[PDB]
Symmetry: C2
Subunit: 348 residues, 2 copies
């Protein structure tokens, strides 16, 4: 599995923006279209010379999105079009709820794999700020908090993430993966404005906005073009989970991707398990038996925020900077109307 | 290619609904969730014993949609939930615009090829009637050119148009569109199951396609209407979005080795007569092969349903071992095309 074959799906670049605060945040006066346009312009400069030389080398743009009309396909495609990605490049809008951005990844993973394409861009956007704006059993469930309701450990959990996120923030740890998004006033945003110092434990995830991109390619095509390689996508698995207890997703998706690859929990160095809510994150980690030490190393959703769409691909950018050469890490998250997703990766 | 390996992505079922008329037709007092719930209750019935038994063997439901909030991901999951498809079955909402129903098929194909799943359901749904109610740079503004205008970018069109209605009613009347169309029951008691438009187009309709690996089909004793060969997409100038089929057909043929003259039926979506004519001409296609039972000019084009519809239609127009393609130009400047084989 650690053997690099020429038919591997390889990650060439994985970047994300600073996650702003919903409603209050840096992004409030901006929508997914400006966020996307801008992140793209940044992401492209960060691209190896043969690519930016011929952008029509990207043969597909899957963009995950949960709240726009039709998942933002017209605006997101216009945005790509403004950031130099040629018309010659098809675009696909996807919405698998909370995992959307991780599914943009599985979409391109498979196309490349199957030969449909060689090089392909996975995206994730969400402007919860400007978009949150839009009964007979079973179907009566479907689309969060109450499925969670279905506290000491949870606050304990909320603070440690908040502490891990603050350390990491302050230690410069996210300075690699984050890109500066210029705001229309003149400002520029390169810090996650969600993690805060001194969070301890007190009685009383986050509505945010953000973009995140991933550039996959098949190893063969990479070597030929001599393109840097950060790690490689190994597999992906989704599962259906009772909608009333959505959060339970990770406790079923993880074992699934594990069995399908042959790995075991204890073969994983890092787990990027999305914390929609602390109650559910904790439950997932403890049912599986995951080492809490190995969970969300630099802070989670609780502290960082959760821009629905963008999250699944944000965790990828992130898990890559937390990993060390030849390490395996999973990316999982509970999904909205009752699902569970989880992709596996390796550094190199 | 006409060799059959168990590794094949095989169509086990593929039915559609009657395409209602926009703003006035049969479905006007209903939305996607109802069209879906119903289409599915029907489709599932027209499902082989084994699947109906389990229904959990279906491991993914990708479902195109173009105009709903978030392409109808929640509403339609519930519909599937309500029509007996288990929670266990994940779901994905896709929006490739005009080709959404086809790319939803592309989706299912790939997952099956890449071993991700065995059997999967592809869908298309749209209710232009209900949902049709949902930058300043020289490049992305082309993603603001109204479709019709891009068509601006007559006799021959009207002649091409005429045939569409002619072939469609001739065929509707001869009962050609019967095996494919399922009966969508309506609130006011009136069952609907006949195409309004063809009576010698904005519309609402649903469509479903149940792929499975060949090896798997033979294992569960399942019927096999045909096979998915390839699919290909290619961007195109948004100002002439229509020219999309002219490029995606060569590309998918090329990807397969096939040639134009190797194709029997050419189900090229008629989004406009001006457009479809061009692809036809540029490609050098025998009209007797293009849209045999008429097109969308008569039948209507329920945006995200179409792709999944054309597959239903084509699979009847094709005889055992015939190859045919399904192309359509795509909204913001694209073009798709797939290739199927009967058996």
């Amino acid at each position: 599995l650690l053997e690099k074959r020429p038919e591997d799906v390889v990650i060439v670049a994985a970047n994300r923006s600073a996650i702003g605060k919903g409603f209050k945040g840096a992004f409030k006066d901006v929508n997914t279209d400006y966020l996307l346009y801008n992140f793209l312009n940044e992401f492209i400069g960060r691209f190896p010379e043969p690519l930016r030389a011929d952008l029509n080398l990207i043969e597909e743009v899957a963009c995950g999105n949960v709240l726009n009309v039709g998942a933002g396909a017209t605006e997101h495609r216009a945005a790509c079009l403004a950031s130099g990605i040629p018309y010659s490049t098809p675009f696909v809008a996807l919405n698998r709820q909370c995992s959307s951005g991780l599914t943009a990844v599985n979409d391109i993973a498979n196309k490349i794999k199957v030969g449909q394409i060689d090089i392909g861009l996975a995206l994730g956007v969400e402007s919860m700020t400007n978009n949150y704006k839009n009964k007979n059993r079973e179907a009566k469930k479907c689309l969060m908090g109450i499925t969670n309701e279905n506290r000491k450990d949870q606050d304990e959990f909320a603070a440690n993430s908040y502490q891990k996120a603050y350390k990491a923030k302050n230690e410069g740890l996210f300075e690699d993966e984050i890109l500066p998004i210029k705001l229309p006033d003149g400002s520029i945003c390169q810090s996650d404005e969600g993690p805060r110092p001194n969070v301890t434990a007190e009685s009383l995830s986050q509505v945010s906005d953000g973009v995140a991109g991933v550039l996959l390619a098949r190893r063969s095509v990479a070597n030929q073009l001599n393109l840097p390689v950060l790690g490689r996508y190994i597999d992906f698995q989704t599962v259906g989970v009772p909608p009333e207890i959505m959060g339970v997703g990770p406790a079923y998706a993880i074992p699934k991707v594990l069995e399908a690859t042959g790995l075991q929990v204890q073969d994983i160095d890092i787990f990027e398990i999305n914390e929609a809510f602390a109650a559910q994150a904790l439950y997932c980690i403890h049912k599986l038996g995951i080492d809490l030490n190995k969970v969300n190393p630099r802070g989670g959703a609780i502290a960082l925020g959760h821009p629905l769409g963008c999250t699944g691909a944000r965790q990828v950018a992130t898990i890559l900077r937390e990993l060390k050469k030849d390490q395996i890490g999973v990316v999982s998250m509970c999904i909205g109307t009752g699902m569970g997703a989880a992709a596996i990766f390796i550094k190199e």
